[PDB]
Symmetry: D2
Subunit: 465 residues, 4 copies
């Protein structure tokens, strides 16, 4: 069931309809690399949902009400007031991924000074760390562990909350590491395991009980806080009749602070937040806000424009609209269901993305000729869809030895910008895969014509084998 839009479209961005011959020429000119295509030559852009979504009329109108004062801005205050009412959190820092680069060293040093945390021993835990969160932890000299559940990565076992903490694993790892050495726990909602999977409130409570017992800070990683609430409302029976706003207020009792990119569920193309619940984390607020100024070794300035704080102050509420959330999730489920139905297999698919197995769909192409890059190119040729390879092409070469890194699965990622495309586009995408699947034997592998040393996936150019 694709639901009907709980909205009227009011503003559209025209996208031209190209011919097959035009797209054939285009994909050659961009070196068989959709990252190098002009946006205007892409009909359905599934590259990312981060900051590419539509917004409501009230959100767009808020951009015209900015107070651009360096300090004391009413736009900053409106944004802090939205955080206070929605999450119950007293302290807000607007960010231009909610300054993981700030809270991480702040929480490491806090435990260092207070409990004799030992940097050579330290380990941070998550139900599943986002890549960048894991990145800033490691840069700071912190090992991470994902304590996810047995069922997380198991497709063909259906489970309501596959993003849950492994509560026993978490307790065991804190004990094994030593709780003085565990500078924070990140609870990621919805979790980035397995395509995007929700986290139950019962689970967060149990997790937060464990963290409070050991006095370990819990940071909610909250880019998808509203979809997580919607899943709790839909699947966790205790919360069936609660509103999204009620589930969210209750949810946030089970963390000490939050970090979020606002570019997903909060429906804006710019911004993030780093927020602290109450005075017990005042000194962590102070220290973060201070490091925000001097993160570089000395003062730097700037910050979100006033109209963008105003827009986010509305977007935190509009992103919780129940009809909207029901519609958004149903559309993502509709695409995955329609792909399954035509025999396209995903290695994982969830709220965040569907990962199509291009290896299996295109079995005649060796992994080193990038069957998921071939399939991205072919989807572009056939339907003007742009999607990102997550396989050997992205994985790239060993920087010590210059050989191609080995890669377990050659996947093509489909993400869906919010409130941007319709059921007819979803049917268009399914139809395109049906065409590809049927023409699969004829699709060629790729080989480099131009290859950068690092980050090759963004600007390499390839030709057909």
């Amino acid at each position: 069931k694709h639901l009907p839009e709980p909205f009227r479209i009011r503003v559209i961005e025209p996208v031209k309809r190209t011919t097959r011959a035009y797209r054939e020429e285009a994909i050659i000119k961009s070196g068989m690399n959709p990252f190098l295509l002009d946006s205007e030559d892409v009909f359905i852009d599934l590259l990312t949902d981060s900051g590419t979504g539509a917004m409501t009329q009230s959100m767009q109108a808020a951009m015209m009400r900015g107070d651009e004062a360096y300090s004391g801005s009413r736009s900053y205050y409106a944004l802090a007031e939205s955080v206070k009412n929605i999450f119950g959190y007293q302290y807000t820092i607007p960010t231009h991924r909610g300054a993981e680069q700030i809270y991480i060293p702040v929480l490491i040093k806090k435990r260092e000074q207070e409990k004799g945390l030992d940097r050579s021993k330290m380990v941070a835990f998550s139900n599943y760390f986002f890549d960048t969160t894991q990145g800033h932890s490691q840069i700071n000299g912190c090992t991470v562990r994902n304590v996810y559940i047995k069922e997380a990565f198991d497709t063909g076992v259906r489970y309501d909350f596959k993003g849950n903490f492994d509560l026993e694993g978490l307790e065991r790892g804190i004990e094994e590491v030593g709780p003085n050495n565990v500078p924070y726990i990140v609870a990621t909602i919805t979790s980035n395991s397995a395509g995007g999977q929700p986290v139950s409130l019962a689970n967060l409570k149990a997790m937060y009980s464990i963290a409070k017992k050991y006095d370990i800070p819990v940071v909610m990683d909250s880019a998808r806080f509203a979809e997580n609430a919607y899943f709790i409302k839909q699947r966790e029976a205790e919360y069936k009749d609660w509103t999204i706003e009620q589930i969210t207020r209750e949810t946030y009792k089970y963390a000490d602070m939050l970090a979020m990119s606002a570019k997903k569920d909060a429906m804006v193309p710019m911004g993030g937040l780093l927020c602290m619940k109450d005075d017990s984390f005042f000194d962590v607020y102070t220290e973060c806000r201070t490091l925000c100024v001097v993160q570089e070794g000395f003062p730097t300035y700037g910050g979100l424009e006033g109209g963008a704080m105003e827009r986010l102050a509305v977007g935190l509420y509009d992103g919780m609209n129940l009809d909207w959330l029901a519609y958004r999730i149903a559309q993502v489920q509709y695409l995955v269901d329609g792909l399954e139905e035509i025999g396209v297999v995903c290695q994982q698919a969830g709220g965040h993305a569907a990962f199509v197995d291009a290896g299996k769909l295109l079995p005649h192409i060796p992994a080193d000729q990038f069957p998921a890059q071939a399939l991205a190119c072919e989807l572009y040729k056939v339907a003007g869809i742009r999607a990102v390879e997550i396989g050997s092409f992205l994985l790239g070469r060993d920087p010590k030895t210059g050989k191609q890194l080995p890669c377990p699965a050659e996947l093509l990622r489909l993400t869906i910008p919010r409130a941007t495309y319709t059921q007819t586009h979803m049917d268009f995408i399914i139809e395109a895969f049906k065409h590809v699947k049927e023409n699969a034997a004829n699709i060629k592998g790729l080989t480099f014509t131009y290859e950068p040393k690092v980050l090759r996936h963004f600007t390499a150019k390839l030709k057909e084998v």
Copy 2:
């Protein structure tokens, strides 16, 4: 085939999803009259496409570039420049239906002074006059005749250009009336006959040949100029490879001036135009612009705001986008086709509206209990759709005798705001009719509880029989 949107949605207006019990209470509170419902309680509002459509990003951004000067505004100039480039017409008057109330008396008096037109004899001709155009002609003491073709109103005969002038009828009526007595001809594109039907370029040329022979002014009534061009491109073989802009420039050679509401194909919620092609109609431009100031008997002032002229200067171009026009028309065709397929019959359906025969769908309800008003209410109850009755309820009472006027057909009109709802809404509407059709026997007729003397359809309240 519903086509995929040739656009990304960028701004949405949220619409809440109501329960059946809520809508039941709502429709009672509004006296079984959807005109009295709050917009926010309507899920799919099909009341009208006039000024209810979405617009493009460039159009919305143009509202921020207004020059509000009383005279000499660059926003006025940008709008005149768009008219000049799109239609070839040299003289533009922005209107806040393009001042039918202005051109009509101007053209009557012109022929009066120049050719001895006799007001007691005069008759104006159209392929099909819009109601208001007919209204201002008659107020001015002018009889109108619609010279439409045999095939116009014939459903089950398919014909590519059912809005065409009856060229022989037009020649005969000018001859019968006397060409001194024919103050103008209005060519309406697309025509309002039969639900909205296009007019061929071959037909307009032939018509304009007739008018030039008699030196009779031709006014193009142009609210749907772009859909008319699209139909010519799709169905008139000579123009198959011409662009919409080329067909439109060629089209407008076959009139002397144009009048249009900008609230349909030009994609704005406010405005219209009254324009004159070249210096041969300079004196008619002068006289119109003059009457625009003193229409009331003395000077009055005002006019479109600058940002609205800017927005319309873009909207005239954006409304011609070929992918957009193909998509818009295909969606309207999709709804009508889907209604036919479930056994819902329309007495007429075309580009502008589909007229569902509520008499036939609800045969147990007498015409005086308003079966199309009942059906409007029931569609609201079942699906939250609002649609307007065009039957005995609208027709109303004889003002000399106070009895219900007799009415030939009890119809429910579906219009579709542009770029506002999706295929999923269209399927939702079809499903609602499928439900109604199946529950038809149980739907009750209506009778007044409150009835105004005039215009009763807007504010009367009714109850079930």
Copy 3:
């Protein structure tokens, strides 16, 4: 004292700085007629304050929140709610001068049916009718009388409320005419007598006491309702500590309905209102709203766009801001004071406009060569200022005899768009007049090179004598 702006400028419209030689060429090209200049060639445009003013951030942002529904729009409701809270008036009709053309025939017929008003006898009264209000009264066959006070037109007598009703004259005229024959009284605030002059609350109460005694409808003509409140706050001692919102609510007890152009104090470039206080005028609301649809002899449609109702719903509040009103009025007073100080004499000057006596400043030019048109041209040449002549040129020719009408005073009007230009522009204007005054003897009179039959001031072209 020019006050400092109680605001930060946030959005500007660039205006180029021209050379004297450029302006000399420009004014020739426009036939010595500033009405024919391009807006972009005018540095300071003082043609009119109607719809040319700036607006606040919240007002501009409201344009993005429109509900474009044909009926039941939340934007209409927000606008009615602002009227209800600000004026206490229960019934609102948005207009695209607040439909004088509607209330006038409605109130005439009301008194006709109810009290045997006799159309051949009828007379309407005002403290001072605006030209268009007088126009629609007369078109409807109603004589008007302005009952203004002795002090109104007397400069050099200073009086706090020169827009007051002559209460004894009003009582005498109702008695002389017969109260059955007086279809309404219009109370104009601020009054258009003498350049714009305020009306006291004590005066409106006394007036409304007279009207209630005779049961005559009172319509508040309200384009400048906020400046009128500000003058009451500043000069009527009883109201010194009341807020503008309190004075306005109290003010509107002393009328039965209001009509206003929103294009002055309500700070928008489009719109007006026609509103009725309470159920005692329900039937007049019904009848107006009905005539709004069928004013032409049959139904016509349209109305303000949703974002424009939203914008006006805010603008009614923002136009009452006390700091803003103090600043606006002080700037207008600053210009007049600075002109007086350099020996420029105005025949009248008040809140609305300053009328410079060009006859006296340029005494060598005969009235038939349009000394105020010459002075408009010269101000353009010297400083790029555009201002409108109110003298023999505007007055024009007798339409029975073709001779120049006789005209008592040859004036040049300066109006000041709200929140648009600064003290430095005001000093620039004063300096320009100082230059003109000093060069006066050398300025030439004008004579026609092209003269339309009617409304010649808008498009005639002249040359120097």
Copy 4:
């Protein structure tokens, strides 16, 4: 001469007018620290010009035309196209101070690999480094030298281009350091020496001749590129009749790349640019763009929103408008001249800021009781002006020893947001200083009630002594 605004105000942000008693209470509540005041309680906010300025109608409208695609955005292309046409530079990277943190390590390593630069020896040169630029150089292990001219800091010697490179000093320092060891030269325009001082084109050419001879990269630090062009047009005779756009294109021949905050002359509240002239710096473009992704040690994402690139693409042109630049600079000069005239002395004053000597104005207050903080508070009390102390309070304490750092001058900085306040505000500020100066003896010093360890100026609270 304050010039009249070469613009009409179109959008205003209301600012309430407070009473003296209210401001007295306010400044106490904010701990005698204007950084802690609400923006809404500040009448004239002179805290900073960075991102606080107004923008043009076209710039604001461009925010509605964003293409939010992750790669290949037409908004990115429009922004690169503006850079190409205005600066002649082929490669653009949009930044959210134009990524000093990126070019610096990139240019250091370039010279390391190519010329055997030795990190222990390296020194970068500028006519005057901005604080943050100096910061990122030093963090990267690079010593900086400012090679400014003798006349730079000398007030009472007037000199047309006090921001010029000391060309002989620069040659001597490269020779003394060794040109292999000089990773870049930054040319800052206008220069931040002495309150903001321009740099001649003759000087930049001579500088770039020196840098090309040694093959040292030159980066133009360009936040005020347009004011610098205006000063060249006004004072460098060779360029008197050239346009701002011509001077800017010619100027940029004399660098290899540019870095700029767009938040000053480019008139936006968000954004910056890092750009490279031609293919000779292609590899530096590649390396910067690459480090932009992996600056943290791993990939992070995001970047300016599409509407913000569109807005900056216009703002680069609108910020060059000659009338605007003449007006902006004249206003800043007007304030400084008016302060001089009443006996207020500035230790330095230029294009960027005026630094009032609070030590001299308030001689009875010891430096350790923060006479410039006292004066900031007093200006707030008297006139609602907010200004930032640059004295012992900002300087703060030695972090090794906890004692107050010694500070040479106790200054109060006045900066002026662009196109935000008028001559009447400037006169208001001068009048406030006149009052302060007259009441000087009575103003009290301050002492801490709450003092953070670091960055105390932002959130410390003080009381009167």
